[PDB]
Amino acid sequence: FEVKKWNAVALWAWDIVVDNCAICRNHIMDLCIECQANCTVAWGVCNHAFHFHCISRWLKTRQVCPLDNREWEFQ
């Protein structure tokens, strides 16, 4: 079989491998909840990129990733 003509829809998104900051549940383009009213993005060794303030508070609480069980580190 073949097709004479086709119609499509496509959801373009930026090519960043990370999607969201899973602390404040805010997209990483915008600012964290601690930071909106007044930031930098901190990556991880386990392909974990979140907000700087959120990561700082989380590591002040515990040295564990918020989704898996692995020791946090900077880049």
**Hey, which bits of 1-75 come out as E strands?**
20-21, 26-27, 41-42, 50-51
Q: What is the DSSP letter of 54?
A: H
- Of 11-30, binders to another protein (CB under 8 A) are 14-18, 23-26, 28-29
Residues in contact with 55: Cβ distance below 8 Å, sequence separation at least 6, in sequence order: 23, 42, 72
- Of 34-73, binders to another protein (CB under 8 A) are 34, 36-37, 39-41, 43, 49, 57, 60-61
- The number of residues that bind Zn ion (CB under 5 A) is 12
List of residues contacting another protein (CB under 8 A):
14-18, 23-26, 28-29, 31, 33-34, 36-37, 39-41, 43, 49, 57, 60-61
